[PDB]
Structures are given as C-alpha cells and as structure tokens.
Symmetry: C2
Subunit: 255 residues, 2 copies
C-alpha cells in the first residue's frame, strides 16, 4: 500500500524542507556539561507526521537521493550550529555531528562541500563532525585513510560510530585520523548484566585513552550507567537518560 | 631442488629429521625464565638445518601438515615433562607450539591434544598452542567452540602475531586465550615509528585488562626490553635473550635459570 506512496511523497521532500535534523545532546561525564549534539534526520510529513529514518532512508537510497540527503543534513546541522553560536557566544566549541551512510564518504565532491559549509558558517575546525561506521573503513582501509585525512585537513571532526560491533580493529584504528570513538548502545545498556558487554566497554574506553581518542558512550539510559562510565574515565555520554533527538527550540533550552 | 626437497620430505617426519628447537620466553621485570616456544627445524642429512619458511610450504602442498603438527606436539610435550620432572621448583614452566592456518579445524585435534597431555602427565596449561588471528577470522564462531574445548582439555592458548591484520578488539574479548603475543615488527620499529609505538602500547593494556599475559616478540636488545617493561609488558622473547636453542642448549639455560 504505502511502500510506493511514500516514494511519491518523498520525491521533492528534501527541497521542501520536510527532512530536518533533530538534536540529541552529548554530555561530558566529568563535569555534567553539554558538549555537543548528534543531529538525526527526521521526516515531518505534512499528512503522516514525523517518521523515523528507518522508514525513509531505505527509500532515499533506492531513489538515489542519499547524497542529496547528506548534503542537506550537513548544511542544516552547520547552519543551526552557527545560528546558536551567534545567539550564545558563551559556548566556545560546542560541536554538532552528522551520520554518513555506507559509501557516502566516497561521494564525489564531499571534501569541497564540507570546506564550503565550514567557511560560510564561520565554524572552527572540528565544530562539525562526521560519524561513520567501520563498514566504510574495512571496505577499503587505504582509500578510507586518504579520504578521512583530506576531511580532517578541511576541518571536519571525525567519529567512529558503533565501535565494539563487528571487527573493532585495534590496528586499523591507529592509522585512521579519528578523534572520537563511540561505544555502541548495546554494550552500554547490557554492561551491567552481560560479562561480554562489560569487557567491550572497558576495553574501548581504555583503548581510546591509549590512542588519545575521546570516547562517547551511546545509550546511557540512567544515572547509574552514567556513573559507571564516569568511573572508568569515559569522556562523554548520550542517550535517553539525558534526552532523545530534540527539536531545535527544545535543544536551545540546554544552551 | 624444490621437488628434490619434496622427495626428501617423504618420510622425513617419520625418520625424525624435523625436530623442535626451543626459544626462551622470559619475565621482563625479574629477567627470569617462564618457558619456551618450540620451533620446528629440519635437519636435512645433506643440506643441514633448514628453516620453516623453506619446508613448511612444501609440507602443506603434500597434505602433511597434520602429521607435522602431531609430531611437534608430541616432541614438545615429551621434552616438557622431562624438564618439569627435573625442575619441581618451576611450577609455571610451559612449552608452546605453533598450529599453522587451518590446523584447528582438523577433526580429531582436541582428542590428540588430550592424549598428549595424558601420556606426558602434564598439568593443565603447561602445554600451549599458539594460533594466528587469520586462522580464527575465517569462521569466528567455529573457532570459539574448538578453542574452548582445547582450554577444557588442559591446553594453554596463545594468540600469536597480534597487531597484524585486524587485531580485533571485539573477538579477543570472547575467545578463551590466556596469552597474547605482539608481533616482532611492532617491537622492532616502536623505537622509530609512532604507529608501531601505539600498537605495542595499546595491545599491552588491552591484554592486561583482559587478564591476558602479554609477550613481546622480537626483543633484540636491553633497550627494547627496558622500553617494554616500562610499559608493563609481561614477558619477552627474541634474539636478545636467545634464539631457538637445541634441546641440550635449552637444558643448560633452564638449569642456569635457577640462579637468581
Ligand atoms: Mg550516530
Ligand atoms: Mg548509524
Ligand atoms: Mg551508534
Ligand atoms: Mg609463534
Ligand atoms: Mg607463525
Ligand atoms: Mg609471532
């Protein structure tokens, strides 16, 4: 029924401004302070209401609009970040992250588009971060190494999302210019009653410290998980224990 | 000369021409001996000692890998029991043997290992099997089960050449290894290479936080040993201590190790 109607509605949705970022807070465990946001795509359909990425992203992909979606999300994330910095100069280097789907990292013109977005939004280096999964790196490690260095050289921060799943290669990591590792949600939420998950959480945290990478635990559901991560030296946390992806005006309240 | 060697390999394991030499593994802090890695050497009647890279490939072309693994394990196990009996005061003396790619999938491996422990009357963990990460990345869940059964039979388990390839943090947390070895290359070049320095440091901490004893391979001098122990690395092996020794030479090294 709808599987085909959505495609009709989805065409042009990006240009109409219907797919917009929502912002989930990332908090520094040591001080409790807001340190940045992860921007997450949301489709506010005029009829259907808000729809989550799992329901539209696959269709964006089939229609070949992934590149258009990524440019839009990055642009919207960056503009919001600059608008907040102009309204609250007290902040310094509050960051915003954007997720790239598999292969987006190789799209033609990505580096120029990022440089252009940091320029026009007058952002500091590292203010806008790109989150990728290891699929993009295992895919072709040497190529990933080239692309990632040029994105870092252009001013983008870089985060390795969902770390702990799949290979979680210690060797490949030491050669990639990441500045942030994110512990996947599953490990964080089962670390209290799953021995395997507890070992992955501790190792990732210690590994980040040994490699000078900042570590963000994803999926912090409550203050107890928060406190455990803090005791291990984990840098940041994000999850429903703090807040979901917020609309701009709700996110602005944290500033 | 390739097929000439191949002809010479027929029945060579049988005539006992391929035998183990033992390289010491030592505790870095106290400089004491903890064990040996058993390394195969072919003492050809005419050509003299031939290293594994020159015959190991031939052993596999002829499908003799299992016969070689069996012989090396038996020979290392017999030598270990003799040493342990002549050295009651070294409760932790172990010997290691290397399984080449695919050996852990052999049907009767666990039974063979179990028999070797029994006939040589070895305590649990005295005999270790060293496997590479590639031999495990082929089928992670299969290998996990097989490794667990080897642990349960009383064999020690070491993950050799760590640092190379994937060096998977996720898989290492789930596999029942007791020892992790850092590949020679990173230990050699950690002095002049930021990357190798990072691999060596983080493998040590990862290993230790997982309750694994870490062994640095390729310790070539007192400089590498001191830099490794100032990282808290457990053990080391390498030409800076001794190469793979003949059994008569290893016995002397063992005897001298009693002296502080
Ligand atoms: Mg993400
Ligand atoms: Mg994702
Ligand atoms: Mg994630
Ligand atoms: Mg070895
Ligand atoms: Mg080997
Ligand atoms: Mg090795």
């Amino acid at each position: 029924l709808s599987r085909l109607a959505l495609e009709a509605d989805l065409r042009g949705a990006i240009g109409r401004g219907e797919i917009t970022p929502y912002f989930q807070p990332i908090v520094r465990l040591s001080t409790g302070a807001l340190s940045g946001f992860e921007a997450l795509a949301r489709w506010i359909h005029p009829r259907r209401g808000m729809l989550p990425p799992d329901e539209f992203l696959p269709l964006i992909e089939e229609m070949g609009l992934m590149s258009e979606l990524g440019a839009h999300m990055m642009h919207a994330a960056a503009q919001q970040l600059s608008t907040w910095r102009a309204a609250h100069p007290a902040m310094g280097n509050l960051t915003v992250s954007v997720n790239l789907s598999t292969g987006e990292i190789d799209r033609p013109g990505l580096v120029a588009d990022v440089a252009e977005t940091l320029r026009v939004n007058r952002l500091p280096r590292g203010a806008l971060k790109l989150e990728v999964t290891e699929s993009d790196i295992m895919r072709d490690p040497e190529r990933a190494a080239v692309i990632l260095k040029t994105l870092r050289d252009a001013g983008a921060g870089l985060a390795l999302d969902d770390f702990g799943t799949g290979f979680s290669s210690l060797s490949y990591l030491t050669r990639l210019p990441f500045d942030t590792l994110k512990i996947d949600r599953y490990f964080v939420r089962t670390m209290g009653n799953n021995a395997g998950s507890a070992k992955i959480v501790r190792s990732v945290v210690k590994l980040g410290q040994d490699l000078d990478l900042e570590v963000v635990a994803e999926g912090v559901e409550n203050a107890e998980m928060a406190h455990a991560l803090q005791s291990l030296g984990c840098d940041y946390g994000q999850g429903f224990g703090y807040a979901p992806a917020l609309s701009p005006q709700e996110a602005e309240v944290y500033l």
